[PDB]
Amino acid sequence: NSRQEILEGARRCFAEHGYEGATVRRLEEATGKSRGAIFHHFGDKENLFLALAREDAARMAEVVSENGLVEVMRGMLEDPERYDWMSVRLEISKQLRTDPVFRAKWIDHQSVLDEAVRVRLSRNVDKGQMRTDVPIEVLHTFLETVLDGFISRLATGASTEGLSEVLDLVEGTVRK
């Protein structure tokens, strides 16, 4: 599968050199595929990057499905090989605000994850596991917010110590 070779390779060139530093030539080196093979499949570097971001959204969506966003974060605690790639995701923050087409592409590529959270939370509410003194959307934004904070600290090299107890506290904050 040539698409999946390109994506596994790209995730590494990106992880090691960052967004700007993943040149087309370096992306050939990491993938064993030509400029033409790469752009044929994905059009441009930005769409390649978004496809990877979609892969994270699809895997996180499965995890969320099973056991919510606390579980994604628990898993993030176990996957230190993923922190360089998380760095890259944070680098494009500026573009996510200066560029409406990219921003819309980013949001669309994240939609599978966004839907899974809504479904997971809805089923939790349906089963009476979530606290009902706080609106569910506030719980949602709360957990989104902790997630983004987790990605950021891990990305920036902060220690993982006490984050596990932070997670126990996040759970307790939103459950009955």
Binding-site residues for Mg(2+): 171
Mind giving me the DSSP string for 115-163?
HHHHHHHHHHHHTT-B-SSS-HHHHHHHHHHHHHHHHHHHHTT---TTH
Total residues in contact with a second copy, by rule CB under 8 A: 39
The reply to whether 101 sits near a second copy by the rule CB under 8 A is: no
Q: Which two tokens stand for residue 161?
A: 């110590």
Distances in Å between the Cα of 47 and the Cα atoms of 4, 20, 54, 115, 131 are 14, 14, 10, 21, 40
Q: Binding marks (x or -) toward a second copy, 1..40, rule CB under 8 A? A: -----------------x-x--------------------
Q: Binding marks (x or -) toward a second copy, 140..169, rule CB under 8 A? A: -xx-xxxxxxxxxx-xxx----xx-xx--x
Q: How far is C-alpha 9 from the geometric centre of its chain's CA atoms?
A: 18
Min CB(41)–a second copy separation in Å: 25
Residue from 60, 70, 88, 130 binding a second copy (CB under 8 A): 88
Residue from 72, 116, 146, 170 binding Au ion (CB under 5 A): 72
Min CB(153)–a second copy separation in Å: 6
Give CA–CA dist 174/20, Å, rounded. 39
Q: Which does 75 bind (CB under 5 to 8 A by kind): a second copy, Au ion, none?
A: Au ion
The reply to whether 22 sits near Au ion by the rule CB under 5 A is: yes
Give CA–CA dist 14/49, Å, rounded. 8
